[PDB]
Every structure is written in C-alpha cells, then in structure tokens.
Amino acid sequence: XXXXXXXXXXXXXXXXXXXXXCXXXXXXXXXXXXXXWXXXXXXXXXXXXXXXXXXXXXXXXXXXXXXXXXXXXXXXXXXXXXXXXXXXXXXXXXXXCXXXXXXXXXXXXXXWXXXXXXXXXX
C-alpha cells in the first residue's frame, strides 16, 4: 500500500524559510498521479497550496503562496518538497502530500500523507 510521509516541518521564525518535504517510495514513481500539497491551520478546513506534474515539472502553485510555495519533485527519489520562503507569521498549518490519481476526470487526492505540522511564528 501507499505510505506517504511528511518530514522537515518546523517552527520557522516569521519570514524564515523551511524545507518542508515528503516521500512516498511505496507509491508509483511519477508514472502515475501527481504531487499535491494541502494544508490546514488550526480551526480551518483545507487549501490546495501547491501541486506539480511530477512526471515532469509542470508547477501549479496556488495564488495564496505564489511567491513562496515553490513545490518541486524528484521522480528519481520518489520524493517531493515545498521549501517555502518568507513564511508569513500567520503560516501555521499542518501540511500533507497526496496522490492526484485520476481516470480521464479530476483527481481523487488519494493516499493522504502523515501531515507533519509546522508552526511559523514571529
């Protein structure tokens, strides 16, 4: 089964960068699905902060963090990262990876990751 896991979350100082990352060796190596990140603050639902067509490198970051959520992936390592810069002091959320599995239709966001949380603060 898929086993995506989050890593390197941090209580980053406001405006600091942190190399949040995940890996999912059990899942297909880009041959399928796509990278997707989502996050949620306490008392919040979710937002599709970032994505990438992992088969290659076609990025699709959300406007909310257009200047920071530079999602990237290494198909070769069955791994991905979102080393956002200039964290807002308000950017405190759990973040998790998902598999954008699809069938000639919008993706299902399957195999949600462990969701390690960060805690950016001033």
Binding site: X27, X29, X103
Partner: protein, 117 residues
C-alpha cells in the same frame, strides 16, 4: 533484472527496465530475412508516430475511456503488462491509426505557410 525479468511485475516497476544443402540454406535465409523485417517494422512504427529513438514517448492522442476506464493508480501499481496487453488488445489498431494521424497533422502545421518563416 534480465530479459523479461519484469514480466511478473506491475507495469509501473516494469517500465523502469525498458532499456533491457539447399533445404537448410533456404530455411536460414528465411530466418534472417524475417528477423530483419521484424526489426524494421518496429522502427518504422516508432518513426511514423514521432517516437524514433524513445523508449518512453508521449503523444497528443488523448486516452479514450471506452478503450479502458481504469484509474492510473489501479493500472500502473496493480496489473502486469501481460494482463494489460490482453485488456486492450481489441483497440490496438485504433490506437495506432490515431497516433499516425496526430503525427502527420503535427508535421503539416510545422511547415504551414503562415507563421513559419
């Protein structure tokens, strides 16, 4: 690893190893000629579809759910290539015809008179 080493593997993992006496005289000539014809048939199809030199070749032909309606996550991480070949064997010629048409249209656009020179 090995020739056909991935035959029992799922398609995903398997895709990572794609880099792997006149009586007698007539039989030998037939064998040699046939081997050449088979070689050329595969290279010619890859050429005509715009996949010459590629083990992995993307195309501009969309997947039609009628050929198969499965999710990538239940194909690449689940079934073997032998099974896949059987599942869509009935559409083999359809796919090939579409690939040829797409490549020929791409070439016509390449040399169209407008917005070329």
């Amino acid at each position: 690893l090995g020739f056909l080493g991935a035959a029992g593997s799922t398609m995903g993992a398997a895709s990572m190893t794609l880099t792997v006496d006149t009586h007698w005289g007539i039989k030998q000539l037939q064998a040699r000629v046939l081997a050449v014809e088979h070689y050329l048939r595969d290279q010619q199809l890859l050429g005509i579809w715009g996949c010459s030199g590629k083990l992995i070749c993307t195309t501009n032909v969309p997947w039609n759910s009628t050929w198969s309606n499965k999710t990538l996550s239940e194909i690449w991480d689940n079934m073997t290539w032998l099974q896949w070949d059987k599942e869509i064997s009935n559409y083999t010629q359809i796919i090939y015809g579409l690939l040829e048409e797409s490549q020929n249209q791409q070439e016509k656009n390449e040399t169209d008179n407008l917005t070329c020179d």
